[PDB]
Write a protein that binds this ligand. Sequence first.
Ligand SMILES: *[C@@H]1O[C@H](CO)[C@@H](O[C@@H]2O[C@H](CO)[C@@H](O[C@@H]3O[C@H](CO)[C@@H](O)[C@H](O[C@H]4O[C@H](CO)[C@@H](O)[C@H](O)[C@@H]4O)[C@@H]3O)[C@H](O)[C@H]2NC(C)=O)[C@H](O)[C@H]1NC(C)=O
Ligand SMILES: *[C@@H]1O[C@H](CO)[C@@H](O[C@@H]2O[C@H](CO)[C@@H](O[C@@H]3O[C@H](CO)[C@@H](O)[C@H](O[C@H]4O[C@H](CO)[C@@H](O)[C@H](O)[C@@H]4O)[C@@H]3O)[C@H](O)[C@H]2NC(C)=O)[C@H](O)[C@H]1NC(C)=O
Ligand SMILES: CCC(CC)O[C@@H]1C=C(C(=O)O)C[C@H](N)[C@H]1NC(C)=O
Ligand SMILES: CCC(CC)O[C@@H]1C=C(C(=O)O)C[C@H](N)[C@H]1NC(C)=O
Ligand SMILES: CCC(CC)O[C@@H]1C=C(C(=O)O)C[C@H](N)[C@H]1NC(C)=O
Ligand SMILES: CCC(CC)O[C@@H]1C=C(C(=O)O)C[C@H](N)[C@H]1NC(C)=O
Ligand SMILES: *[C@@H]1O[C@H](CO)[C@@H](O)[C@H](O)[C@H]1NC(C)=O
Ligand SMILES: *[C@@H]1O[C@H](CO)[C@@H](O)[C@H](O)[C@H]1NC(C)=O
Ligand SMILES: *[C@@H]1O[C@H](CO)[C@@H](O)[C@H](O)[C@H]1NC(C)=O
Ligand SMILES: *[C@@H]1O[C@H](CO)[C@@H](O)[C@H](O)[C@H]1NC(C)=O
Ligand SMILES: *[C@@H]1O[C@H](CO)[C@@H](O)[C@H](O)[C@H]1NC(C)=O
Ligand SMILES: *[C@@H]1O[C@H](CO)[C@@H](O)[C@H](O)[C@H]1NC(C)=O
Ligand SMILES: *[C@@H]1O[C@H](CO)[C@@H](O)[C@H](O)[C@H]1NC(C)=O
Ligand SMILES: *[C@@H]1O[C@H](CO)[C@@H](O)[C@H](O)[C@H]1NC(C)=O
Ligand SMILES: [Ca+2]
Ligand SMILES: [Ca+2]
Ligand SMILES: [Ca+2]
Ligand SMILES: [Ca+2]
Ligand SMILES: [Ca+2]
Ligand SMILES: [Ca+2]
Ligand SMILES: [Ca+2]
Ligand SMILES: [Ca+2]
Ligand SMILES: [Ca+2]
Lengths: 387, 387, 387, 387
Amino acid sequence: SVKLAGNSSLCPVSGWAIYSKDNSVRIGSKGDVFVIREPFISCSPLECRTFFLTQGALLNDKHSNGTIKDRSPYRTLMSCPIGEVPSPYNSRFESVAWSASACHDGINWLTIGISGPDNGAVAVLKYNGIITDTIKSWRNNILRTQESECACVNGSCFTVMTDGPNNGQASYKIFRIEKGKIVKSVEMNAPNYHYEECSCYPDSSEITCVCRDNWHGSNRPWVSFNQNLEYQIGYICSGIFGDNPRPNDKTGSCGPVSSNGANGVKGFSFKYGNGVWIGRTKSISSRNGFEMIWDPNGWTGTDNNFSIKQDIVGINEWSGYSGSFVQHPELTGLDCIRPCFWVELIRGRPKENTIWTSGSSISFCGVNSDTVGWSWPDGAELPFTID
Amino acid sequence: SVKLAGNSSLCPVSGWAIYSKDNSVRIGSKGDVFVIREPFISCSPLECRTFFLTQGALLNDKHSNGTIKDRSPYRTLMSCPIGEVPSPYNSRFESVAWSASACHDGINWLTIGISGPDNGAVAVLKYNGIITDTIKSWRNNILRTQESECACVNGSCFTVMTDGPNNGQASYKIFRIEKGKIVKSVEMNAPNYHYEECSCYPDSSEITCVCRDNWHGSNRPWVSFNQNLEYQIGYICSGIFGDNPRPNDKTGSCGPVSSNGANGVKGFSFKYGNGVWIGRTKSISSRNGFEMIWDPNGWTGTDNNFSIKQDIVGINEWSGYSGSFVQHPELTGLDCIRPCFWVELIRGRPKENTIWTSGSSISFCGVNSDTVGWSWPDGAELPFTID
Amino acid sequence: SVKLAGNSSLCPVSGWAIYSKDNSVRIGSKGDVFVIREPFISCSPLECRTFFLTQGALLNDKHSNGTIKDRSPYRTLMSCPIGEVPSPYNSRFESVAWSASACHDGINWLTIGISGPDNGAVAVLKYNGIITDTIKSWRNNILRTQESECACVNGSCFTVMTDGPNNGQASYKIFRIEKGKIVKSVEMNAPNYHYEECSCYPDSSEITCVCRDNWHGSNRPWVSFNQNLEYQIGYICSGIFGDNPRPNDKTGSCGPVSSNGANGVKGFSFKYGNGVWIGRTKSISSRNGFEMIWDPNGWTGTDNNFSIKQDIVGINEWSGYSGSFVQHPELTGLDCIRPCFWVELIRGRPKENTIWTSGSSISFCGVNSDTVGWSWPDGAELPFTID
Amino acid sequence: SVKLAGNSSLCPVSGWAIYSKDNSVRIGSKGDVFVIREPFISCSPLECRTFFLTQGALLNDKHSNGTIKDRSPYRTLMSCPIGEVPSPYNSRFESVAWSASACHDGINWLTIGISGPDNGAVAVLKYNGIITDTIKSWRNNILRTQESECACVNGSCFTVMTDGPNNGQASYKIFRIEKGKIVKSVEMNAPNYHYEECSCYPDSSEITCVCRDNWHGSNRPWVSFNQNLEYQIGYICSGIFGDNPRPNDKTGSCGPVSSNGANGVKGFSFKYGNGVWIGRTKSISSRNGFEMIWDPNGWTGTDNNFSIKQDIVGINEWSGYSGSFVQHPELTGLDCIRPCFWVELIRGRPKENTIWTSGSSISFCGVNSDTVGWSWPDGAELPFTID
Ligand SMILES: *[C@@H]1O[C@H](CO)[C@@H](O[C@@H]2O[C@H](CO)[C@@H](O[C@@H]3O[C@H](CO)[C@@H](O)[C@H](O[C@H]4O[C@H](CO)[C@@H](O)[C@H](O)[C@@H]4O)[C@@H]3O)[C@H](O)[C@H]2NC(C)=O)[C@H](O)[C@H]1NC(C)=O
Ligand SMILES: *[C@@H]1O[C@H](CO)[C@@H](O[C@@H]2O[C@H](CO)[C@@H](O[C@@H]3O[C@H](CO)[C@@H](O)[C@H](O[C@H]4O[C@H](CO)[C@@H](O)[C@H](O)[C@@H]4O)[C@@H]3O)[C@H](O)[C@H]2NC(C)=O)[C@H](O)[C@H]1NC(C)=O
Ligand SMILES: CCC(CC)O[C@@H]1C=C(C(=O)O)C[C@H](N)[C@H]1NC(C)=O
Ligand SMILES: CCC(CC)O[C@@H]1C=C(C(=O)O)C[C@H](N)[C@H]1NC(C)=O
Ligand SMILES: CCC(CC)O[C@@H]1C=C(C(=O)O)C[C@H](N)[C@H]1NC(C)=O
Ligand SMILES: CCC(CC)O[C@@H]1C=C(C(=O)O)C[C@H](N)[C@H]1NC(C)=O
Ligand SMILES: *[C@@H]1O[C@H](CO)[C@@H](O)[C@H](O)[C@H]1NC(C)=O
Ligand SMILES: *[C@@H]1O[C@H](CO)[C@@H](O)[C@H](O)[C@H]1NC(C)=O
Ligand SMILES: *[C@@H]1O[C@H](CO)[C@@H](O)[C@H](O)[C@H]1NC(C)=O
Ligand SMILES: *[C@@H]1O[C@H](CO)[C@@H](O)[C@H](O)[C@H]1NC(C)=O
Ligand SMILES: *[C@@H]1O[C@H](CO)[C@@H](O)[C@H](O)[C@H]1NC(C)=O
Ligand SMILES: *[C@@H]1O[C@H](CO)[C@@H](O)[C@H](O)[C@H]1NC(C)=O
Ligand SMILES: *[C@@H]1O[C@H](CO)[C@@H](O)[C@H](O)[C@H]1NC(C)=O
Ligand SMILES: *[C@@H]1O[C@H](CO)[C@@H](O)[C@H](O)[C@H]1NC(C)=O
Ligand SMILES: [Ca+2]
Ligand SMILES: [Ca+2]
Ligand SMILES: [Ca+2]
Ligand SMILES: [Ca+2]
Ligand SMILES: [Ca+2]
Ligand SMILES: [Ca+2]
Ligand SMILES: [Ca+2]
Ligand SMILES: [Ca+2]
Ligand SMILES: [Ca+2]
């Protein structure tokens, strides 16, 4: 039982091999499956788990009514084994939460679950299931976090939280956590940037996060930092815009791209020097489809050329959030940190005529062997009996 | 594998961080969730479990009919992991019981489950799931116990049991138990006192219990004792009255407060010198709302002044029983015993137009970091299909 | 990990403390609970399990139709933790079977499951879940076994099987089994005796079985034997008759009591020298009620006097099969083998107007501390939705 | 924790003892049971598991509609303990797949799950749940594999895959896999042969596979090979034809038997010198009944004589796929590899008037002790509520 080192580089990847699919919404038509959104995957040295925010209700029951609503006292962070449906009969209780993050340092699970009122929310940090720290809203305006895994390097785990407007300048802080206790934090000095829902991973002892600008950017902002929280900030420069909504691909910017910049979706990308692996929706205007694109100069260069595209979900099918996750060498036995990703397939409101909103999930792992594009969509037939 | 020492003091706490919420009644609208009441939490050195008294029936099924009834041969003590719904598919069987207690000494679980007729009930003690002792009613009038966790100190666990009227003078005994065997007991000499449903915890090698006077007290009675069962008794002196029902706050007493004193609700409080942390309903007349109040002189002083109030459940929402539980240093790695508490959110009869009565639960742990008041209510929409 | 010794004597017991209740039929009204009959309890050095014969169907589903029928290719022997309902979601698969036995030698589980046609049935023996032996019908007329636990002493386990008529002279064999392999067997020379459904236990290195005479006895036959299968046979002499049906209590016999002797119910008794602890129905004519009676001279003496009766299930409530089980000192830490028992509470056909037949269960352990009589019946309201 | 040697011979068997029956379809009428087909069994040194291809849907739910369809993005490989129903509450997620294989090398599980489009499908290999390799379609025409267990010998596991037409000459490759990585492969040079759905087992350090000719053979093709993938090929010569459909028994061939040769069913056989144990349907024209036949010269001789037949499923009852599985000496403690087999009992479309297709399963292990013929059919009553 040993701390993850986090000191090897990301593995080189040519393509993405399908890892899991839970079919949660299809199964929940009959079975006892939680209404969920904001799922994410995180791994220990022994296993991979799906974390998710329940709505304290099951699919196809009357208590799923009104689950478009983001924040309530009923929402809880729970987890289950990867690829299994999230049920009351197979899910571990983690925290009371309407925003969350989680990660394993090699020894125990850290979970961060935020609840409370919009004007004074509190993040509750747990290590091995025991409360180890709290942090309260510092701008009194919806303290919130990643909705994907935190990142760990040599016994320290790292996350980003936001507090303030979702449609204007807000406040962004980076945290270093050891055994569930906050040991350091810093406010990012990012005037004119907007960071929401960061997808962070370790690479060569440093953390890279690719986030959502909900204010005025259709490209994604990034922040990277070392273990002392010395950071750098920027936006992905590629004209292959990564947010949803966005414009058609054209010449990009290393600052926020204003065209179609308001609103957004949680997402991710993996940096390889000047290059980038971008996961994005297929539709420029809606949460539909998903694809992976390799742009060899897209981290720093503004053209809209790219070299590989792999289809994940077809343009006519519902998608949603996505996030990164990694598998450390302590799990895989490889000599590098393996990049992986998950996609939330959102069903229900606002786009479909149901009383509820819920998601299923798919995930993929990066490989250098042969792969293929396809579409692996949610597959449920809506509406349901309850609607 | 080592016995809990129980020799450190209670941790100092400024406020309460949310720890769990099971949403049992919401989920049970569709899922297979036991009808339960009298839930409580207790921890080992490895995990925290919810114990509860089933009615041998599931929510939204005809066998939930008439579950306002307290004692039957169908009620069982069972347990599940904290925060999970109590289902037949995730719950461990403990004992046949219509009143119960349980606690872990560091090595194994002790459960105490009382069943049989009102005029001759028998407590069955189990250690590691094996029957180790029994004790039979000594006044032939509903032998009954805590409905929350027993308290353990250096291999010995301690509980309190009552036998006799619920509306006049009864008989109260303290027990010391080792490996599931009663090794000592004493009858408390408490004329004019009434003790029901004690919430007991360890603090510096001694046990303190805060209980319910169902006869003629709207403040709570207490009993404290050492390992040889040498005890002291009194009532909480604060004019911040702890029971439900109760009068509006005014000058208190350190005997039983007769105004609104008949009837009651199980509750708890934590003593810190002359001060007290009081958990109570918000309503003076019904089991609605919940709040935590820090009164720095409330154990021994009679004024109705207090320094901190933290909201837990809104005044218009259903609450119910509450109890203490602790997390020992052997679980947390701290240097003190961490006080925590649970609240039962009772749904159905007598206050709502259903055929059934059941509860869900919430819990909190004491911290010295930032916290916030809110309302985390049950959230089910009654009546149900079966009603 | 060590073989059970089986060499200490049965513990002296004054009365019976309630150990489990599963409420299976009440829960199965909504939940996913197997239709079962012929349940029984057996323990390892670490835990106690409920074994049972499913009908390959769930309660309140159409496939429960016709489950009065004893033998089919759908019946399977499965097991779950004691006191939990038998569900597809918590039950371990053991064997394909319409008659069964099971026991733990201290190292692994032995299961014996008989299936096949009436004219050529085969017992499949499994040790640690792996097929270790078979034995085929030797009279071609419903090879059948205990429906309760086998008995183990120093690495050998022992059982009894019958083949031939249920209403006349049949053939009875005793088996010694080591690591799932039959190492010895003998045919009992018992002209004019009838043995069905033996309840066997260890006591001081020897096995005692108390069985059902379905031909012409309203008292119970017994067989006892050592590890070399040197046996003795008799009938319980007490005028406190043990079978169902039976006459009113009167002077008994050490041979089969012909009055009301045909038909029967599986049951048990525990021998203490000349004395006996008898479990029986309360009704002389029907499977209703249950009671424990201590008759200090009832093993060898024919009077109808007895000294203790303890009520278990009221005379107006449904009962059914019962059987012995033991808890070895390797489990309990005691210096003797603890006698325990279980009762099957049969619901449905033939006595009630349902399409199905199923049972729930209760169990008790022998103690020398205080106990009480009561009634702990099944408690389901019949008929069900499906009927 | 040690690799399976795989160097002992197959155990001699006189007959087949029933090992498991899951009753999945019966139970799924009410319970939450996956729609599945292509089940198979495989064992580790500690346990036996059922693997299966879900349709991402539950029985008696609308999403079971159209499950006659073989390949979709919703199908997943999952596994549960042998004999238990495949539910979302007891099943481990393995891979996204519409064709699969799995096997344990003594240390960890290998799973192979093929998904993607018909013209470019990709097999994802996982070792201990971690992606270790991929292989992509080489003829762009439904890359596909065994639907039963792979075979392991001294740390290397072996499988066969087909790519190309199901009704004419296709391409067949053998693979050697170590810790989930392909280390060797070879294309079989088998003009005029057709290999689908191979049932492979180890015997004396070499692998033998018995497969389905879907093009023009009513007898079964075989391939056998050593660890360096040096192979031999032929067809089972017995006039006791093994496929379904097939002609009535008559003089056979050791090439493909053209009469009734098109189409087929997955099956198996076990070679013992010149002899063979053949599992087959009872019907020559449809997937009904099942029987085991010992033909002492049937591997290499063409007559239609045989020595032993054991009934498994009656001629009027539904059967389906069948496959081999083995129990190694490391699991059993025997000195030889124990042959066992499973049968899929297919319910629904095309033969029955439902919207869905699913199966249940039975399994048997080879013994030299007494056995018996019977019928252990599926037993569900179709149609269901949803139909
Ligand atoms: C939960 O429990 C409640 C309480 O038992 C139950 O509600 C009751 O349902 C029964 C059956 O519908 C009702 O009983 C009837 O009452 C009427 C008068 O109101 C009588 O006329 C009926 O008696 C006639 O019918 C019987 C059978 O045919 C005859 O035996 C009898 O002699 C009469 O001819 C019968 O007593 C009862 O009124 C209600 N009570 C209330 C308060 O609603 C409820 O249905 C249960 N729910 C579930 C889901 O279990
Ligand atoms: C399982 O799948 C089957 C196959 O899809 C499904 O059975 C089908 O149900 C649908 C809906 O009831 C039927 O479709 C209708 O067919 C009639 C003629 O028979 C048409 O007139 C209907 O079209 C009208 O209505 C539509 C909606 O209002 C309009 O969009 C349309 O333009 C028309 O006005 C409609 O197409 C279909 O006939 C059956 N098919 C069969 C073979 O039974 C079944 O219900 C599914 N079951 C479950 C549980 O999912
Ligand atoms: C409050 C800002 C935040 C990020 C833009 O909105 C999120 C957007 C969401 C969305 O765009 O789907 C759903 C999230 N559950 C919500 N987060 C919270 C904490 O309410
Ligand atoms: C019998 C006295 C006792 C304490 C006042 O009543 C309790 C009150 C209850 C209550 O006030 O809600 C419910 C408890 N289940 C009941 N206890 C038992 C054993 O019946
Ligand atoms: C076949 C004789 C046997 C013992 C008398 O009948 C049993 C009686 C039964 C009974 O009296 O309830 C139910 C048992 N399931 C049945 N056993 C079998 C194997 O069918
Ligand atoms: C595609 C050829 C293949 C072997 C003949 O067809 C199989 C026949 C089937 C069958 O005959 O029942 C069902 C299998 N699920 C299918 N395999 C796939 C991958 O689709
Ligand atoms: C990474 O950390 C490991 C584990 O402590 C260390 O042994 C090794 O030198 C480092 N790897 C590099 C520099 O690639
Ligand atoms: C959904 O909730 C709203 C608000 O309480 C209510 O008015 C409506 O009837 C509900 N609908 C259903 C179908 O449950
Ligand atoms: C990792 O942290 C430990 C603290 O246990 C520290 O002593 C060590 O130097 C760190 N290692 C690296 C490679 O930074
Ligand atoms: C508490 O008990 C521990 C464990 O035995 C002991 O080592 C320690 O001295 C005790 N401390 C006090 C202050 O009693
Ligand atoms: C019982 O067997 C034990 C275990 O081997 C042995 O040590 C002991 O002598 C025996 N007990 C008796 C005779 O009571
Ligand atoms: C019970 O089974 C019989 C025999 O198949 C059948 O005729 C009857 O309709 C069934 N009844 C129900 C209610 O399922
Ligand atoms: C128990 O059986 C063993 C076989 O391992 C034998 O050698 C030993 O003598 C037996 N002990 C008793 C007490 O009979
Ligand atoms: C089989 O392999 C085992 C395990 O390595 C070895 O000890 C044994 O000699 C082998 N036997 C034969 C006959 O190859
Ligand atoms: Ca944006
Ligand atoms: Ca570019
Ligand atoms: Ca009171
Ligand atoms: Ca005060
Ligand atoms: Ca259900
Ligand atoms: Ca009889
Ligand atoms: Ca007598
Ligand atoms: Ca063919
Ligand atoms: Ca032949």
